[PDB]
Structure 1
Amino acid sequence: PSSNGPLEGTRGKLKNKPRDRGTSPPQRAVEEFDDGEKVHLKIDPSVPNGRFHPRFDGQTGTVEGKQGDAYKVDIVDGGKEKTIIVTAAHLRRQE
């Protein structure tokens, strides 16, 4: 990489297909999850806040409590355990 900022090489993953462009539906930004639930991490290009580091796009973690309205999701980066602060807007129920 020519630089090392968080958004380095995120042109694709943080861009919407032309038709999914524009404010996203509120339903999924208000979704409620319970501790223990499995959630898929995926930033919604249209929603600025509640994001996590792009490197974790695609992960599937375990909700374990929350902080404010945001959720605390536990994932395992390679072999390291990490806790991610993320809002519902960027989460989806597994299965």
Structure 2
Amino acid sequence: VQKAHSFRRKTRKKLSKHPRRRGLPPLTRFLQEFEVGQRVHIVIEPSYHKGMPDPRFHGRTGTVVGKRGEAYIVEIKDGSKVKTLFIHPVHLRPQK
């Protein structure tokens, strides 16, 4: 039986957390800052449910191209299409 894709489809392990990492994460990831042109990895924090990108884009690396509110505008290349996402800094990590 075909199943359509939803936000939490097949995310039992991808969006799970380590048992020893249960609770609030350290505030550094929440309060980190980025600059235009910087490249950041998309690593979702399951506890924070706001500003979360689609899990299909988890683990990719994107380019910051602006900012709106408290969310960063991240551009990715899915195949040959440019996709723009609004991701909270808690779901982001600097490259290197």
Corresponding residue number in structure 2 for 1:86: 87
2:10 is equivalent to residue 9 of structure 1: yes
Corresponding residue number in structure 2 for 1:66: 67
Q: TM-score, with normalisation over the residues of structure 1?
A: 0.93
Provide the alpha-carbon RMSD of the alignment.
1.1
Q: Which consecutive aligned stretches of 4+ in structure 1 deviate over 3 angstroms post-superposition?
A: none
Instruction: Measure the CA separation in 1 of the matches of 2:5 and 2:36.
Output: 34
Give the Å deviation of 1:3: 4.2
Please list every run of 5 or more consecutive structure 2 residues that lacks an aligned counterpart in the other structure.
none
Q: TM-score, with normalisation over the residues of structure 2?
A: 0.92
Give the Å deviation of 1:4: 2.5
Corresponding residue number in structure 1 for 2:57: 56
Instruction: Measure the CA separation in 2 of the matches of 1:66 and 1:24.
Output: 23
Instruction: Measure the CA separation in 2 of the matches of 1:46 and 1:24.
Output: 9
Give the Å deviation of 1:10: 0.9
Work out the percentage of aligned pairs sharing the same amino acid: 45
Instruction: Measure the CA separation in 2 of the matches of 1:3 and 1:76.
Output: 23
Corresponding residue SS for 1:34:
coil
Deviations along 1:36-82, one digit per CA (max 9) or x if unpaired, are 00000010122221210000001100001011010000001122110
Is the CA contact (8 Å cut-off) linking 1:70 and 1:88 kept in structure 2?
A: yes
Please list every run of 5 or more consecutive structure 1 residues that lacks an aligned counterpart in the other structure.
none
